[PDB]
Design a protein around this nucleic acid. Structure first.
Ligand code: K8I
Ligand code: DG3
Ligand code: MG
Length: 639
DNA sequence: TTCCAATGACAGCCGC
DNA sequence: GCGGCTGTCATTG
């Protein structure tokens, strides 16, 4: 039967609860947030509307222990239990002793870790288990889990507990979601019971699939590193952004006025229909699609397609990068600067990490605008700055996916190239554009990068032709030459497709499985798509495993040499200059840290050493470190 | 429908 | 009319 024990209603019940809690090796917690220093709970950073009023603990059955964090105002509070006394006993039960294996189960661990630190001044110090991450680990292509989907799949007999609790079908924790008519006490108590029991079932399934070691040693520690990143945020300068915006907007104005004179009338740059009417009906250019690929061919024949492409590039930087950054910026009064607080997203097909609100991974590379034949550099990344005195440190793996592919295919030709061979992208660009390596621009090297990974991951002659600007036949010859020169790779492609067809899945270097039932499909497209996913998932997923291990191992090292706070949040939630390195961004094969001037040499050594040691392959994991006053102005730094 | 992975703005359409 | 859905366009790795 569902029972909620209000432990703070009676001194005697409270101590019995505290004694039992202190001996538990496993329990769930769920935070109780409701809509409105206050007597009735702890304000949440970023929401003037909602309070943490308590939390619920579960360690078996359908008993929730509700632990109130209200000074005044379920039976009422025993007044001998001061809030200060409760906060003591709370911090005591949520922090590890020496040689004590202790696991806390939290739905949306990251959001809960942050609220406990910033709102209640409590830093969790135990092993963490998030059922959302366990779901992902069992099927990475599953829809993002909700409490409702977890209970549906893993605890279906308890679905009645969720009847009339419609917010259980949203992504946000039932306890944290104060946009309900149900009390935080009831919501957190139900969640605590559903999550504890759900996690027992998820742990049995992880053990059956042999993913429990991955879950405890890589994925949950990776979530802890991402919690520190989300507490840290990334520094942002508005002055740099505005000055770039003004140059961009001037170019957009000139492009529009010239486009409209060539067209003969106004047209919307955002309507494919309008652009198609102008290009194909009203100018009779040869084709109706208005894609990048189409306009890229046609720019050789008339100026308007090129103007369209530049309009979309610059409009993208203004409306999808500047507008959201200058809206999501937040004053940090301790560091004395604006920062952006993006949200990590780990539920991906291959185990990459991405970001939302906003997605800082998508901030444009440097690009050039010409006006009156004078070039202006647009560096959106230059707006992302360290705290005063600090530096940005970036460490990137050199061709990690190629090194992993070499290791798994034992391809002797690819190993030679990686051992000595110059930049492969520059080599391809040179051969293609009839030049020696040195002339390649950034844009052209990116085109060659797309060609090289494209071919490796099963790009066809029609598409390679559009990209290289050559006939399908010439592209098909290029594909054959690749396959002939690197026969190891081609054997590994056929051996991976054969093994996928048999098993219904592929596995990464750490044992994670992706299910590709399209592999058996009779439809030629769906079959070929699955075969391409099979090959790409093993290499891209393996790379994502290595970067996670690197991230986790760097964080351990930083915290040993840590005579200082493990995140900027740990100073906010505390209430003496900044020392150490702060994880600020992940870019798939690249880690960014914000580092105090004094510590950049030591942090650069730790980061490089730990990234190069993450795993042992047939080939060396090469790491380049760069350093600078912004993400946009990073310079090579020999470590 | 023929590189893979990702987020997100933005016209435009359709059952409610 | 209105929110959901669905391409389509962009960008990054
Ligand atoms: C101009 C052009 C276009 C398209 C293809 C190729 N071919 C068949 C290659 O061989 C090219 C260059 O001749 C040497 C690098 N290179 C590589 N290409 C691929 C696809 C792949 C690789 C790699 F996997 F080995 F890295 C290399 C290299 N090295 C060439
Ligand atoms: N399938 C595919 N994977 C890509 C593509 N671009 C990048 N990736 C994957 C493979 C490389 C990895 C990291 O991308 P980078 O741009 O850093 O590539 P890199 O090979 O490391 O180049 P660089 O030397 O500039 O760091 O992401 C692409 O167009 N297709
Ligand atoms: Mg790289």
């Amino acid at each position: 039967s569902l029972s909620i024990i209000d432990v703070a209603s009676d001194q005697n019940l409270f101590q019995t609860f505290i004694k039992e809690w202190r001996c538990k090796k496993r329990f769930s917690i769920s935070l109780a947030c409701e809509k409105i220093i206050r007597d009735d709970g702890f304000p949440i950073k970023g929401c003037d509307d909602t309070l943490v009023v308590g939390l619920a603990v579960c360690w078996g059955g359908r008993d929730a222990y509700y632990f109130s964090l209200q000074k005044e105002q379920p039976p009422s509070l025993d007044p001998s239990l001061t809030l200060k006394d409760r906060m003591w006993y709370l911090q005591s039960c949520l922090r590890k002793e020496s040689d004590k294996e202790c696991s806390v189960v939290i739905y949306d661990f990251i959001q809960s870790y942050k609220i406990l630190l910033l709102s209640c001044g409590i830093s969790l110090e135990q092993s963490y288990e998030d059922p959302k991450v366990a779901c992902w680990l069992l099927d990475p292509d599953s829809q993002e889990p909700t409490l409702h989907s977890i209970v549906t799949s893993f605890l279906p007999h308890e679905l009645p507990l969720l009847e009339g609790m419609e917010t259980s079908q949203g992504i946000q924790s039932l306890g944290l979601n104060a946009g309900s008519e149900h009390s935080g006490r009831y919501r957190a108590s139900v969640e605590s019971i559903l999550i504890f029991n759900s996690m027992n079932q998820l742990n049995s399934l992880l053990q059956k699939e042999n993913l429990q070691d991955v879950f405890r040693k890589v994925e949950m520690p990776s979530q802890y590193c991402l919690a520190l990143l989300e507490l840290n945020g990334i520094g942002f300068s508005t002055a740099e952004c505005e000055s770039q915006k003004h140059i961009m907007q001037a170019k957009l104005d000139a492009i529009e006025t010239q486009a409209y004179q060539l067209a003969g009338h106004s047209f919307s740059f955002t309507s494919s229909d309008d652009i198609a009417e102008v290009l194909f009906l009203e100018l009779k250019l040869p084709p109706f699609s208005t894609s990048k690929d189409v306009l890229n061919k046609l720019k050789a024949l008339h100026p308007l397609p090129g103007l369209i492409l530049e309009w979309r590039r610059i409009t993208n930087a203004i409306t999808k990068v500047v507008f959201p950054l200058q809206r999501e910026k937040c004053l940090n009064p301790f560091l004395g600067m604006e920062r952006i607080y993006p949200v990590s997203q780990s539920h991906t097909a291959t185990g990459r990490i991405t970001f939302t609100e906003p997605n800082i991974q998508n901030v444009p590379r440097d690009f050039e605008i010409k006006m009156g034949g004078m070039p202006f550099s647009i560096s959106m990344r230059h707006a992302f700055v360290p705290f005063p005195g600090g530096s940005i440190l970036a460490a990137d793996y050199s061709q990690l996916e190629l090194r992993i592919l070499a290791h798994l295919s034992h391809d002797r030709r690819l190993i030679q190239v990686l051992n000595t061979g110059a930049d492969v992208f520059r080599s391809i660009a040179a051969e293609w554009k009839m030049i020696e390596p040195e002339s390649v621009g950034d844009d052209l090297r990116q085109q060659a990068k797309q060609i090289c990974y494209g071919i490796i991951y099963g790009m066809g002659a029609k598409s390679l032709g559009e990209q290289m600007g050559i006939k399908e036949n010439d592209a098909a010859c290029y594909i054959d030459s690749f396959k002939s020169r690197y026969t190891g790779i081609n054997q590994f492609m056929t051996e991976t497709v054969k093994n996928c067809k048999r098993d219904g899945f592929v596995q990464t270097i750490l044992g994670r499985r992706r299910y590709l039932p399209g592999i058996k499909d009779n439809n030629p497209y769906r079959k070929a798509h699955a075969e391409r996913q099979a090959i790409n998932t093993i290499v891209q997923g393996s790379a994502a495993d290595i970067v996670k291990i690197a991230t986790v191992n760097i964080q351990k090292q930083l915290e040993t040499f840590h005579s200082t706070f493990k995140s900027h949040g740990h100073r906010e939630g505390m209430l003496c200059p900044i020392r150490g390195g702060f994880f600020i961004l992940q870019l798939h094969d690249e880690l960014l840290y914000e580092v105090a001037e004094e510590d950049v040499v030591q942090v650069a050594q730790i980061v490089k050493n730990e990234m190069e040691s993450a795993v042992k392959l047939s080939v060396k994991l090469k790491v380049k470190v760069k350093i600078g006053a912004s993400w946009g102005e990073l310079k090579d730094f020999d470590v």
